[PDB]
Paper text:
The vaccine is based on PfCSP, which densely covers the surface of sporozoites and plays a critical role in the P. falciparum life cycle from the development of sporozoites in the mosquito midgut to liver-stage development in humans. In this work, we characterize eight monoclonal antibodies (mAb) derived from protected volunteers who participated in a phase 2a clinical trial of RTS,S/AS0131 with a delayed fractional dosing regimen, and compare them with three previously published mAbs derived from the same clinical trial.
Notably, the main chain of residues in CDR H1 form a conserved hydrogen bonding network with the NANP peptide. Two of these residues, 52 and 58, interact specifically with Pro in the Asn pseudo 310 turn and type I β-turn respectively. For 100 µg mAbs, only mAb239, 356 and 364 from the first panel, and mAb224, 399, 366, and 317 from the second-panel exhibit protection that was significantly greater than the naïve control mice (p < 0.05, log-rank test).
Author numbering:
A (entry chain P): 1 to 8
B (entry chain L): 1 to 94, 96 to 213
C (entry chain H): 2 to 52, 52A, 53 to 82, 82A, 82B, 82C, 83 to 100, 100A, ...
Write the structure that this text describes.
C-alpha cells in the first residue's frame, strides 16, 4: 500500500 | 489507476467574482484530495488538503468542499493574484492528478482575426511545405481550427501553439501549422483554414490556391 | 523550507541519468519524500515515494524496474536513478515533501515543492534552425492591418530567441511557444500585425538567434 504514511 | 477529471478546462472570472472549479474521481477517494495552484514557470503550491482544510498562508477566499467522487474548489471573490491553473490530486489509492483548470481574466468576447500563410518557395525547394493559419487577438480561449485540402478534412498532420493571455488586451493568439511533403502539396489545389469561435456568427474560412 | 533539484539535461534514449534534490530548513529524517514529473501534454504525474528512512519505496507503473529512488539522511538528500530511458520520460521532475504537519490519517499530499529540473530524452543532435518568411498578402490583410512573420523550423535544442527590427518593433509581436515535431526537432513562429499602409515603405526583419548552435539569422519579410 503506497498510501501508508511514509513519515515519522 | 484512479482518474481525476476536472471541468471546465477554462473559467473566465473578473476580480471580485466567485469562481467554482469541479473535480471528479473515477472511484471514491473519501476525503483524501488536495488542490494546487500553479503559475507559468513556477512550481505548484499547496492550497487545500483533506477536502476542506486550508494550508498555512492561504487566504480565506479559497474553500474546498466535497466527499467521495465529487469535489469543488471555490474562490469566493477572486483577486489579482489568483489567475493561474488549479490541479486536484487524490491520495486515497495511489497518487493521481487532474488535468487542471485554467482561470483567466474575463473580458469582452473578441472574434479572432484569421490569417493564412502559404508555404515559402525557399521551403518548397528543400522538400517540405508548411501552411500556417493565424488566429490573432481573440477571447475566450477556446477555438476550433480545421484544415481542408481540396475540401478533404485534414487530421493528424497539424500542430497548434497558443500564447499566454495578453497583459493589456487580455486576448489570446493561436497558431496552427499544417505540414505536407512537397509531393503531396503539389498534388492538390485548394488549402483552406476554417475557424470556429464564439465571436463568429458562422465559421470563418480563409483559403488560397497553390501558386496564386 | 527549501528543496532544490538538479542533475537534469539532455540524454539519448536507452541511456541513464541520476537526479539529486537537496533539502533544507526542516527535519529531513522525519519525512518521506516524493518525485513528481510534469509534461506539457500529460500534465502532472507522480513518479515514486521513499519512506522517511529508506525502508519502503513505491514507484509509478510507468517506471517500475527502470527508476530507483534513494535518500541519505546524513546528507539531507534524495536521489533518483533512471535506467533505460524512453523519450516518453521527458518531463520536468519536481522534488516534493509529504505532508504539511505530521499525521497518520492525513498524508499523501505535497506540502512543499522544489523548483524542478528538466530531463529531455531525445536522439536529436544539436542543429540550427531554418527561417522561412510568413509573407504578408491579400489573405494576410484584414482592414487596415496586415500580418507578417517568420517560421523558425527544425532546430534542437531549445530555446531560440526572436526579435523584430533588432528590438525596435515590439508592439504587435507574438512569439509562439515552440512545438516538438514528429522529427524530434522544435519549431515555432513569430508574427506581428502592422499597419497595411507601411508594407511599401517599412522594412521588417526578424532576428533569429539559436545560441546552442551559434546560429544567427536575419530574414527580411516583404509582401507577395
Amino acid at each position: 500500500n503506497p498510501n501508508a504514511n511514509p513519515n515519522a | 489507476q484512479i482518474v481525476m477529471t476536472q471541468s471546465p478546462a477554462t473559467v473566465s472570472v473578473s476580480p471580485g467574482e466567485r469562481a467554482t472549479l469541479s473535480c471528479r474521481a473515477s472511484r471514491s477517494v473519501t476525503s483524501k484530495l488536495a488542490w494546487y495552484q500553479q503559475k507559468p514557470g513556477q512550481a505548484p503550491r499547496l492550497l487545500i488538503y483533506g477536502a476542506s482544510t486550508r494550508a498555512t498562508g492561504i487566504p480565506a477566499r479559497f474553500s474546498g468542499s466535497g466527499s467521495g467522487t465529487e469535489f469543488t474548489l471555490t474562490i469566493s471573490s477572486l483577486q489579482s493574484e489568483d489567475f493561474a491553473v488549479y490541479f486536484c490530486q487524490q491520495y486515497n489509492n495511489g497518487f493521481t492528478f487532474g488535468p487542471g483548470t485554467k482561470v483567466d481574466f474575463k473580458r469582452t468576447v473578441a472574434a479572432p482575426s484569421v490569417f493564412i500563410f502559404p508555404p515559402s518557395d525557399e521551403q518548397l525547394k528543400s522538400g517540405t511545405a508548411s501552411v500556417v493559419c493565424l488566429l490573432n487577438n481573440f477571447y475566450p480561449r477556446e477555438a476550433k481550427v480545421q484544415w481542408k485540402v481540396d475540401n478533404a478534412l485534414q487530421s493528424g498532420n497539424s500542430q497548434e501553439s497558443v500564447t499566454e493571455q495578453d497583459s493589456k488586451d487580455s486576448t489570446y493568439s493561436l497558431s496552427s501549422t499544417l505540414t505536407l511533403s512537397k509531393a503531396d502539396y503539389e498534388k492538390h489545389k485548394v488549402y483552406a483554414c476554417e475557424v470556429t469561435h464564439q465571436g463568429l456568427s458562422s465559421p470563418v474560412t480563409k483559403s488560397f490556391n497553390r501558386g496564386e | 523550507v527549501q528543496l532544490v533539484e538538479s542533475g537534469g539535461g539532455v540524454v539519448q534514449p536507452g541511456r541513464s541519468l541520476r537526479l539529486s534534490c537537496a533539502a533544507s530548513g526542516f527535519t529531513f529524517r522525519n519525512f518521506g519524500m516524493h518525485w513528481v514529473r510534469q509534461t506539457p501534454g500529460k500534465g502532472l504525474e507522480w513518479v515514486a515515494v521513499i519512506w522517511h528512512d529508506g525502508s519502503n519505496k513505491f514507484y509509478a507503473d510507468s517506471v517500475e524496474g527502470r527508476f530507483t529512488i534513494s535518500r541519505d539522511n546524513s546528507k539531507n538528500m534524495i536521489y533518483l536513478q533512471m535506467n533505460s530511458l524512453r523519450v516518453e520520460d521527458t518531463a520536468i521532475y519536481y522534488c516534493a515533501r509529504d505532508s504539511l504537519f505530521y499525521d497518520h490519517d492525513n498524508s499523501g499530499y505535497y506540502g512543499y515543492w522544489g523548483q524542478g529540473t528538466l530531463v529531455t530524452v531525445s536522439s536529436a543532435s544539436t542543429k540550427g534552425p531554418s527561417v522561412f518568411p510568413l509573407a504578408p498578402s491579400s489573405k494576410s490583410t484584414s482592414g487596415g492591418t496586415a500580418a507578417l512573420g517568420c517560421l523558425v523550423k527544425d532546430y534542437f535544442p531549445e530555446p531560440v530567441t526572436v526579435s523584430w527590427n533588432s528590438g525596435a518593433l515590439t508592439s504587435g509581436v507574438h512569439t509562439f511557444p515552440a512545438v516538438l515535431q514528429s522529427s524530434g526537432l522544435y519549431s515555432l513562429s513569430s508574427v506581428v500585425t502592422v499597419p497595411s499602409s507601411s508594407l511599401g515603405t517599412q522594412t521588417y526583419i526578424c532576428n533569429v538567434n539559436h545560441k546552442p548552435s551559434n546560429t544567427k539569422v536575419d530574414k527580411k519579410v516583404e509582401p507577395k
